[PDB]
Structure formats: structure tokens, C-alpha cells
């Protein structure tokens, strides 16, 4: 049991999957100069806990803008139009000892998702609802929204071989916590934080939750994101 703290946010934790073997870092010019906030930004932003029932198909969050209303990090998105960060993501499950199940906690950089009825697009409020997660579905759906059927998560790939990305299994038999560090994968050193979704944290239950008639009918999944090494553009003159 390790009680990590960052700024004015302390969580209680119980091995880290460093995404692509790299730890996030700063970009290191007088023509373009970055600003490193360091202060705040790095604290833990615990999202709303998500109840995992027997019939839950999955969830996804789209970052960096899932934190668009989260404190100073969600406020520096409105004043600077360029930025980058690292996003240590803790995922606890705090189930009991009689609950069973298994989760895939994967990050999927550049998850370009497909519309539900092709030949058209979706109204841009179907990919993300800032803090709250869009759930997947168990079967196919229609309408101007994301094709959120599992087995074809968002991208038209098999959902089983989604393990190629930075992932972590949460088997309630053994463990309950996951932690992933995603060192800002992008093709340009800095990009706008409202246009571009750098990665898509999606939690997918492979083995479904099961229990008997006495336990609690759900297992709350707690998501915590710490934006590390966040740096922005400069606002001062040179």
C-alpha cells in the first residue's frame, strides 16, 4: 500500500505499464518558446466512478479533452492553443473477494472511430461527453453516432487483438489496480487540445462480471488521470 500524493491530491494505491517503453518528457528556440506550468496540472483528477454490472459492454474516454473542465488543466486548454502531456492513468476496481471478472484497460492512440450508419458523419458530441464515458454496445446500432459495438470497438478492428497498445489486465481474481503512462504520441511536437484527441482510454470487460444474490449488483471502476510534463506555448513577447 503506497499513498501517492501530487500537489493537493492524494490517492491510495496497491506494476506500471510504461507506454512504449518511454517516460513522458519535455520537448527539449527563441522563435517559439514553450511555457511549463508544473504548478498544479500534475495533481490527480479523479473522474466519476463507473458502475460495472453484469451487462456492461465497456466504456471509452477521449483525452486530452476529457479533462477540459478539470481545474487548471481544463482552464489552460482555453488560454493556450498548443500543448502536450503524459497522463498517468490509475484504474482501480475495489470489488470484493467473491466477485469475478476481467477488464482490458487500453489506451489506443489515435482511435479514429466509425459512424454507425455509413455514408454520413456524426455530430461531434457523440465521441466525447467530457467527463462522462460513452459506453459501448453489445450489438450493432444505427443513427448518426459512433458504431459502438464491441468486437469492433471503434475502429473496425478485432476487439480481442486490441492488446497491441499500452494495456493492462485487471483480473479480479488476482489484482484490482492498473496504471498506464502514455508519453504523448503525436506526429507534431505540439498540437491543439480541442481539435485532436491524442488517445482513447477504453475499458472493455472480456470476462463478464458475475456474483450471487447477496453481493452488490455492481463494481465501481475508478479512473484517475495525472497530466505529467504538461507544457504549452508562450504568451509573452520575445
Amino acid at each position: 500500500v503506497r499513498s501517492m500524493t501530487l500537489g493537493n491530491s492524494t490517492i491510495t494505491t496497491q506494476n506500471v505499464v510504461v507506454g512504449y517503453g518511454e517516460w513522458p518528457s519535455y520537448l527539449s528556440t527563441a522563435e517559439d518558446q514553450p511555457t511549463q506550468p508544473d504548478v498544479a496540472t500534475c495533481r490527480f483528477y479523479t473522474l466519476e466512478s463507473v458502475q460495472w454490472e453484469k451487462t456492461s459492454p465497456g466504456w471509452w474516454w477521449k483525452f486530452p479533452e476529457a479533462l477540459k473542465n478539470m481545474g487548471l488543466f481544463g482552464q489552460n486548454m482555453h488560454y493556450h492553443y498548443l500543448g502536450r502531456a503524459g497522463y498517468t492513468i490509475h484504474v482501480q476496481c475495489n470489488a470484493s473477494k467473491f466477485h469475478q471478472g476481467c477488464l482490458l484497460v487500453v489506451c489506443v492512440p489515435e482511435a479514429e472511430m466509425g459512424c454507425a450508419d455509413t455514408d454520413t458523419t456524426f455530430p461531434a458530441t457523440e465521441l466525447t461527453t467530457e467527463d462522462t464515458p460513452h459506453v459501448f454496445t453489445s450489438d450493432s446500432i444505427t443513427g448518426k453516432k459512433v458504431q459502438a459495438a464491441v468486437c469492433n470497438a471503434g475502429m473496425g478492428v478485432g476487439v480481442g487483438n486490441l492488446t497491441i497498445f499500452p494495456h493492462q489486465w485487471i483480473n479480479l481474481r488476482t489484482n484490482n489496480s492498473a496504471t498506464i503512462v502514455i508519453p504523448y504520441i503525436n506526429s507534431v511536437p505540439m498540437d491543439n487540445m480541442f481539435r485532436h484527441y491524442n488517445f482513447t482510454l477504453m475499458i472493455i470487460p472480456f470476462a463478464p462480471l458475475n456474483f450471487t444474490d447477496g453481493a452488490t449488483a455492481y463494481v465501481p471502476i475508478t479512473v484517475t488521470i495525472a497530466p505529467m510534463y504538461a507544457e504549452y506555448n508562450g504568451l509573452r513577447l520575445a
Binding site: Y20, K62, P109, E110, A111, E112, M113, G114, C115, T118, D119, T121, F122, A124, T125, D139, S140, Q147, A149, C151, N152, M155, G156, V157, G158, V159, G160, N161, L162, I164, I185, S187, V188, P189, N192, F194, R195, H196, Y197, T200
Partner: protein, 224 residues
Amino acid sequence: QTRHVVNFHSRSESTIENFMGRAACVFMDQYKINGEETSTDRFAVWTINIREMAQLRRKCEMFTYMRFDIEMTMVITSCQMPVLTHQIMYVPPGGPIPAKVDGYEWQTSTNPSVFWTEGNAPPRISIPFISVGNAYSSFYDGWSHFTQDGTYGYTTLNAMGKLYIRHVNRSSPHQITSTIRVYFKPKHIKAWVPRPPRLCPYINKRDVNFVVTEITDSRTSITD
């Protein structure tokens, strides 16, 4: 066939340059020589992108980011005279395009073009890594216009240019219908961020939309 002892130890054919760097025909098109002075059927266009045919498109979607020089060689035929000379004008991403076979854009000094006359070896034109960013992005989970406007998934970083092709001969006594086959080839290719293979069939050449497909082929029971 029979199961033989396939005994060897090699992964030189599994590297990225030995997997992607293969020439494939990506653009057939017809273009005439005479008649209809204001027509769009006297030249070819082909905006250069990797999402041309699904066999190559599938390989570029193994990887999220990749950068590579392209080295295309056209194979130009003709049907129905003099000896014919062609022009394959590559315009960069920032470049004026012709509207007609006799536009002034064809004479632009910043648009490099090859003048291949018939009978010789095929014309080869090589284009470096043009993009503004540091790699071409196969996938772009983002919006071109800020504040979640239209045009999902299309970034302007992975723009490669266009390829305008015409006869340089002004006219002809009879009709000559030339056919061009552009052979695209990635070169000096690097690739980042692997990605699971495509499962569903492709719908359209500018989006990732799909129909929900089954994972694998089904069998009768779990034990057979």
C-alpha cells in the same frame, strides 16, 4: 501439399522496408488528345494518398505514424500518327492546379514535370517527405476545423500532392486514347506505433466507416 520441415531462421523479409516498399498499381485513367477544348477528359488527376486500393491501404494501417519517400513510375500506353510525348506534372500540396488541358498552370516553374516521349523506358519521378509534421498519419482522431466542426478524421499534414498528366501534342488527325498506370512505391520508410489489423471491409476511401463484421469464421461446437 504436404507439411515439410521448413527449417531456416530469417526475418529480413519481415522488416518494414521489405514489407511496405513494394510497387503496386494505384491509378488507371484514360485521357484523350483532341476534341472538346473545354473538357475534363483530356487529363488525369489522382490526388496522391495511401487510401487508394484496399490491399495497400490495409498495410499502411498496421502503423499509426510513418514517413517515407515515394518513387512512382508511370506506365503509359496509347490506342487509336506522330511519335507522342506526354507530361506528368506533380504539383506540391501548395500548388496551383489546371482546370483545362490548356491552362497556364502547366507552365508553372515550381511544379516539376517529366516530358516522356513514347518508346523509351517508363518515366520515373521521386518525391521526398513533403509533410509539415514529422510523419504521415494513417489515422487522425480529430477535426480539421477548430471547435468540432465538419470534416472528421482529415488532417492536412498527410497531404502528398497531386499528379496531373496530359499529352503535350496540341492536336492529332484521329483520336488517340492514352492509358496511364501509376506505380506507387514507399521508399526509405519508417513506421511508429503499431496497430491491430483491419477486420471489417472498407466502405469509402476518405473515412473509417464500417459494417460490424464477425470476429472469425464460425465452427459447429467449441470442441470439434
